Amino acid sequence: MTTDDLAFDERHIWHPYTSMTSPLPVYPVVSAEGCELILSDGRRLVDGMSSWWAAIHGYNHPQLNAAMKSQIDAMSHVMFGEITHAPAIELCRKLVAMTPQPLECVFLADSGSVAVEVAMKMALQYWDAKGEARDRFLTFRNGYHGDTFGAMSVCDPDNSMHSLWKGYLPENLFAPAPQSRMDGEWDERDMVGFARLMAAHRHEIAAVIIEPIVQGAGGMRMYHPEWLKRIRKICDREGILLIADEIATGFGRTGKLFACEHAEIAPDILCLGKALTGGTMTLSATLTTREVAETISDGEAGCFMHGPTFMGNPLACAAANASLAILESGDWQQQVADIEVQLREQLAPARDAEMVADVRVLGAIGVVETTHPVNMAALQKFFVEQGVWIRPFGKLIYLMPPYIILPQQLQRLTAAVNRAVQDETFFCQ
Amino acid sequence: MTTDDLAFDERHIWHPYTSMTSPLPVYPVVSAEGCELILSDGRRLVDGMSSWWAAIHGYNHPQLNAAMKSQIDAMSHVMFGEITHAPAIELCRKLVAMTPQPLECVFLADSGSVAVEVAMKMALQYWDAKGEARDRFLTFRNGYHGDTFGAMSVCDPDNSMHSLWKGYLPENLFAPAPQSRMDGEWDERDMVGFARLMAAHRHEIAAVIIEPIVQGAGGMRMYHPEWLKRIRKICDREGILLIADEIATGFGRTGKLFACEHAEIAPDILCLGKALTGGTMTLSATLTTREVAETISDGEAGCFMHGPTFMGNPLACAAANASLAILESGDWQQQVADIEVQLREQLAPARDAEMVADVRVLGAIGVVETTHPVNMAALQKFFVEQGVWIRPFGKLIYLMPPYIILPQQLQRLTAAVNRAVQDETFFCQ
Numbered sequence: 001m002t003t004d005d006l007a008f009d010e011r012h013i014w015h016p017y018t019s020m021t022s023p024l025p026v027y028p029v030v031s032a033e034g035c036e037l038i039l040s041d042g043r044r045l046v047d048g049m050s051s052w053w054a055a056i057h058g059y060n061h062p063q064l065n066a067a068m069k070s071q072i073d074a075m076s077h078v079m080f081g082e083i084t085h086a087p088a089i090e091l092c093r094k095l096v097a098m099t100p101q102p103l104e105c106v107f108l109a110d111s112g113s114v115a116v117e118v119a120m121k122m123a124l125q126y127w128d129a130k131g132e133a134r135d136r137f138l139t140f141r142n143g144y145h146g147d148t149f150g151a152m153s154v155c156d157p158d159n160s161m162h163s164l165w166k167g168y169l170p171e172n173l174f175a176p177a178p179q180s181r182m183d184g185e186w187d188e189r190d191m192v193g194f195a196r197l198m199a200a201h202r203h204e205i206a207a208v209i210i211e212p213i214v215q216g217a218g219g220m221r222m223y224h225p226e227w228l229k230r231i232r233k234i235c236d237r238e239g240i241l242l243i244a245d246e247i248a249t250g251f252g253r254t255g256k257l258f259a260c261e262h263a264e265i266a267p268d269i270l271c272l273g274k275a276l277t278g279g280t281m282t283l284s285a286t287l288t289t290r291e292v293a294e295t296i297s298d299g300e301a302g303c304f305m306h307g308p309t310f311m312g313n314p315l316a317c318a319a320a321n322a323s324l325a326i327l328e329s330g331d332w333q334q335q336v337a338d339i340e341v342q343l344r345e346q347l348a349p350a351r352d353a354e355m356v357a358d359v360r361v362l363g364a365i366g367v368v369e370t371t372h373p374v375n376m377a378a379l380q381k382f383f384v385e386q387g388v389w390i391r392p393f394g395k396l397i398y399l400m401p402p403y404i405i406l407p408q409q410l411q412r413l414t415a416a417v418n419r420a421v422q423d424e425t426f427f428c429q
Numbered sequence: 430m431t432t433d434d435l436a437f438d439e440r441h442i443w444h445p446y447t448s449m450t451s452p453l454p455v456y457p458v459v460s461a462e463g464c465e466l467i468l469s470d471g472r473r474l475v476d477g478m479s480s481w482w483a484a485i486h487g488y489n490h491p492q493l494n495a496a497m498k499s500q501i502d503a504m505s506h507v508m509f510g511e512i513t514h515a516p517a518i519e520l521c522r523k524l525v526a527m528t529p530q531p532l533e534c535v536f537l538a539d540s541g542s543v544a545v546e547v548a549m550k551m552a553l554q555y556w557d558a559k560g561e562a563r564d565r566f567l568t569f570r571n572g573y574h575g576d577t578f579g580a581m582s583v584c585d586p587d588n589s590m591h592s593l594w595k596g597y598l599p600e601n602l603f604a605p606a607p608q609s610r611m612d613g614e615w616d617e618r619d620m621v622g623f624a625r626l627m628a629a630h631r632h633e634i635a636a637v638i639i640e641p642i643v644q645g646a647g648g649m650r651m652y653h654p655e656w657l658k659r660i661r662k663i664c665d666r667e668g669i670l671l672i673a674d675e676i677a678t679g680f681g682r683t684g685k686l687f688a689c690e691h692a693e694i695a696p697d698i699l700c701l702g703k704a705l706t707g708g709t710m711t712l713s714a715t716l717t718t719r720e721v722a723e724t725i726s727d728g729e730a731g732c733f734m735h736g737p738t739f740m741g742n743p744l745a746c747a748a749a750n751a752s753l754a755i756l757e758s759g760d761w762q763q764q765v766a767d768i769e770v771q772l773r774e775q776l777a778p779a780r781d782a783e784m785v786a787d788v789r790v791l792g793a794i795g796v797v798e799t800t801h802p803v804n805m806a807a808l809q810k811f812f813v814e815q816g817v818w819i820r821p822f823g824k825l826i827y828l829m830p831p832y833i834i835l836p837q838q839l840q841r842l843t844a845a846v847n848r849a850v851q852d853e854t855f856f857c858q
């Protein structure tokens with residue numbers, strides 16, 4: 001990449017949640033290997049972000065590469081309507097086995113947002129074929145489920161700018177955000193804003209949808225698994241369906257294969273993505289029980305009414321099988337247990353930092369929340385200079401590294417974080 | 430693929446728009462090269478579907494493969510927020526150059542539906558920034574724009590089952606389906622429902638959104654370019670935004686690179702996809718003008734509120750560049766013009782077939798509408814037997830093959846179609 005390349009980027013190319021009029025700098029990445037990213041100027045950053053949850057195996061993993069190139073040689077894409085193929089089968093084969101028993105019907109899709117639209121749509125079609133008028137969704141505050149309209153309607157109203165879509169956006173129910181903390185004391189009084197919400201719309205709710213244990217893009221919070229136990233039971237008695245978005249938490253990122261395992265519960269609907277394909281390309285997965293599967297298919301339409309052009313993309317499915325294959329090894333269990341300890345350990349000094357509100361860790365997830373928003377460009381510049389890639393946001397500086405990160409690598413990350421939160425230099429307001 | 434594999438699929442794996450209790454047959458493809466698809470039994474089908482538009486360069490293209498493998502060797506993926514890279518930059522470099530001048534700001538996404546959800550959100554955010562109260566969308570009936578909630582909102586209310594989502598889905602404005610046909614008489618009465626819809630909602634409409642010239646999966650209809658020119662003026666004189674969905678018509682499918690060229694008009698917002706990457710994997714793109722792009726960033730949000738996890742996916746971006754590179758050769762124009770010739774000639778017998786309502790051709794789009802719904806399972810089975818892959822839908826049998834297709838290959842497609850609409854056998858009265 002050249003001087004004129006980088007100038008084309010700023011003037012024409014949108015980035016996630018970015019201004020065209022005032023964009024802040026970006027760093028030119030030409031390649032990536034192991035737990036590192038390589039900038040065009042040859043610098044190597046240790047990766048602290050896993051490209052946002054996804055790249056749990058690092059980059060240029062050889063297993064991943066070979067599976068990818070072999071599938072391309074057979075065909076990297078062929079339509080799924082209505083053709084089938086070996087990658088798709090073996091992917092839905094794994095997915096069903098590794099998830100709770102009742103989850104055995106699988107809808108592959110292209111992104112996390114699309115899959116959340118699919119769960120959502122499954123819930124409405126389920127109640128419409130049952131003769132029940134249930135169009136409402138119930139979710140926690142601070143939740144994040146995607147950027148598409150439907151999923152936007154289940155995101156934190158304030159975090160997101162729902163005032164922006166005041167009028168277009170359909171109005172749902174948001175219970176207070178889970179106060180009791182993962183590995184903390186369960187306070188009964190936590191269950192009232194929810195209790196009353198179910199009470200007054202109990203007749204109306206088509207589904208409850210939350211991020212299990214970890215609320216990701218809504219603030220990296222980590223609530224008490226006791227919450228999900230309470231959630232499974234009310235849904236069970238109410239009949240209303242439980243949607244688990246494990247698109248961020250999925251595939252043992254939290255120290256357990258799926259996050260619902262923290263409360264030994266299973267959802268009625270499970271959304272997966274991101275880490276699904278080991279951070280190689282976009283793929284998504286929505287699983288459900290056969291009873292939902294059939295009650296939707298025996299309805300008015302005769303079918304579940306969804307089906308994107310690139311459904312079941314063999315290439316993606318191949319990356320996915322390669323990734324689940326790495327996991328099946330089980331070696332991830334100790335990688336994460338080890339990363340957890342070193343995260344909990346080396347982030348500990350941080351709570352004594354004047355700028356730090358809270359430090360919480362679960363699995364390969366280390367969160368250090370400040371009392372003021374980071375100075376993005378400033379901080380972002382200071383991380384690179386340290387040889388590390390860490391994408392901070394609002395009041396959060398956090399780590400979520402490849403499972404394969406070497407202790408000395410984790411160490412630099414954790415050292416950059418402490419370093420960065422002890423001076424008021426990289427903060428505003 | 431083995432016997433229980435195919436059985437696992439039928440019982441656990443969903444397909445586009447399919448029933449889990451009573452799914453219809455499917456065909457197992459093991460690989461694919463050029464313009465043919467190969468079944469597990471070694472059977473070889475000529476592809477007339479281009480895997481639903483996308484595979485304009487056929488399958489296993491050598492340029493396509495090596496670009497993919499090369500990018501795979503540098504990195505198949507790295508987060509774009511906010512990092513940049515060579516595959517993304519060069520893609521948007523090609524995008525901006527090849528589309529009408531005012532279109533120079535690009536937002537990369539993962540699928541068509543998502544691209545449409547971006548176009549809509551740009552439109553709403555645009556009017557929030559100007560203090561104007563415009564939340565409504567104007568669009569033609571018989572249109573198709575995606576399967577996600579927001580895009581669902583502008584799909585044909587009947588074709589799509591809008592009763593199923595009565596309420597949740599926002600209720601938009603629907604002009605009648607465009608009566609005058611591509612290459613025919615422009616009849617002024619055509620513009621009365623539309624005029625009157627705008628007349629009473631002139632003030633409310635944030636945007637007009639339609640498929641340019643060809644109405645895709647909602648009918649395989651072909652309207653008269655005069656509709657696009659007239660629409661550009663009303664939009665302009667009202668100031669309202671115009672969104673063209675070229676996820677299906679884009680990259681020369683109709684005889685011109687982009688279908689708005691038939692009317693020598695430019696949208697304010699353009700959606701792209703499917704053929705973007707040569708149908709290798711999913712990638713999307715939403716371009717807009719610098720006035721829209723700046724009016725939104727200078728709004729309350731401080732950025733365009735979108736950013737998918739895999740935004741700017743280096744792997745996909747790599748595939749697209751090669752596919753666009755192939756087009757740069759310019760061969761597509763006379764390859765497509767020629768395919769247009771053949772469809773016109775050999776689809777001609779169809780109008781003497783009892784079962785055929787209409788026969789229309791535009792570019793390498795051959796359409797044969799029947800008088801009754803096809804017998805999907807039956808029809809689908811007969812084509813396979815013919816050595817061809819044709820995927821019929823509702824009352825339509827249509828062909829849309831790769832630009833590379835051999836005259837001898839095309840011949841078979843069109844001859845299978847002709848056979849198939851003589852008797853009443855493959856149809857369900």
Ligand SMILES: *Cc1c(COP(=O)(O)O)cnc(C)c1O
Pocket residue numbers: 111112113114116144145146147211216217245246247248249273274736737738739
């Ligand atoms: C990342 C995420 C999503 C979004 O998926 P996209 O690929 O960005 O569309 C949805 N839900 C949760 C919980 C996520 O972490």
Ligand SMILES: *Cc1c(COP(=O)(O)O)cnc(C)c1O
Pocket residue numbers: 307308309310540541542543545573574575576640645646674675676677678702703
């Ligand atoms: C195919 C298509 C879409 C949908 O894109 P997906 O990848 O299937 O979500 C949207 N609009 C038009 C005009 C299309 O042809």
Ligand code: NA
Pocket residue numbers: 095096097098099100101102103104
């Ligand atoms: Na299971």
Ligand code: NA
Pocket residue numbers: 297298299302303448449450451
């Ligand atoms: Na059915």
Ligand code: NA
Pocket residue numbers: 524525526527528529530531532533
């Ligand atoms: Na342009």
Ligand code: NA
Pocket residue numbers: 019021022726727728731732
């Ligand atoms: Na701004």
